[PDB]
Amino acid sequence: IVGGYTCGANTVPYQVSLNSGYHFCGGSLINSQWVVSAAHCYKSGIQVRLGEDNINVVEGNEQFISASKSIVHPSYNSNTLNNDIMLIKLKSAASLNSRVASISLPTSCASAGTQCLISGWGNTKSSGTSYPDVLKCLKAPILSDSSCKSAYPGQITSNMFCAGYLEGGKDSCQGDSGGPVVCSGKLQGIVSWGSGCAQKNKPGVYTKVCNYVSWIKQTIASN
Numbered sequence: 001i002v003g004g005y006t007c008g009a010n011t012v013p014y015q016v017s018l019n020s021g022y023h024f025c026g027g028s029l030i031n032s033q034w035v036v037s038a039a040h041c042y043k044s045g046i047q048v049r050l051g052e053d054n055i056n057v058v059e060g061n062e063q064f065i066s067a068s069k070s071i072v073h074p075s076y077n078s079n080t081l082n083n084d085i086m087l088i089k090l091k092s093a094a095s096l097n098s099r100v101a102s103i104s105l106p107t108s109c110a111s112a113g114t115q116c117l118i119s120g121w122g123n124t125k126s127s128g129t130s131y132p133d134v135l136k137c138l139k140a141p142i143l144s145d146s147s148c149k150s151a152y153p154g155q156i157t158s159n160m161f162c163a164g165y166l167e168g169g170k171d172s173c174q175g176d177s178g179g180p181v182v183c184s185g186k187l188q189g190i191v192s193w194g195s196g197c198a199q200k201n202k203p204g205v206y207t208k209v210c211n212y213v214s215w216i217k218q219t220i221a222s223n
């Protein structure tokens with residue numbers, strides 16, 4: 001997260017770290033056995049780490065659970081990143097409490113101007129790499145579709161939306177992919193991609209979760 005602030009320990013209880021010997025993507029807990037992340041974060045050997053703040057220190061509240069299976073959306077396109085969403089089923093259910101809680105899926109899509117919270121352990125520099133030990137937060141608004149398509153002509157599909165600041169300075173970045181974009185307590189986006197991090201007129205692009213709620217529900221119901 002570039003231009004953000006330290007969230008405070010366990011203040012984002014639905015945030016998870018996908019780990020394979022190091023943190024490589026974020027994700028969101030939607031019920032005690034499933035996590036939603038981005039399809040491009042897919043790899044085998046994923047251990048999901050819940051209740052984290054410092055990902056390099058066991059401070060208490062952490063729950064490390066292996067993924068039993070990861071379901072990449074069947075229409076995921078790795079060249080355009082269209083349908084960049086993945087569901088991860090946990091080997092055992094997590095124990096939910098005030099520090100580990102799930103976030104609600106939306107019933108309607110959010111409008112431009114809606115303020116959301118984006119979080120993650122990704123790079124905090126736009127020019128260089130500085131990875132934090134604790135979770136960083138950024139409050140950012142959803143941009144209009146016209147500003148988004150004007151910034152990335154021919155690359156935005158209806159399953160994507162832009163959020164951020166056109167003046168540059170605040171953005172999600174490498175290591176934040178797969179994590180949450182929460183607006184008024186509903187999960188509206190998944191960190192997907194961007195051009196560099198926090199550059200002027202290049203806002204971050206997110207997977208539009210409201211377009212996938214029936215897919216998520218039907219997939220969870222059959223697995």
Ligand SMILES: NC(=[NH2+])c1ccc2[nH]c(-c3cccc(OC4CCCC4)c3[O-])nc2c1
Nearest residue numbers: 024040041172173174177193194196197204
């Ligand atoms: N500027 C942004 N809003 C942005 C947000 C998330 C990003 N994630 C990445 C990213 C870059 C290189 C490799 C990645 O993931 C690979 C390692 C884990 C598997 C895929 C990224 O997510 N760039 C990103 C840029």
Ligand SMILES: [Ca+2]
Nearest residue numbers: 054057058059
């Ligand atoms: Ca820790």
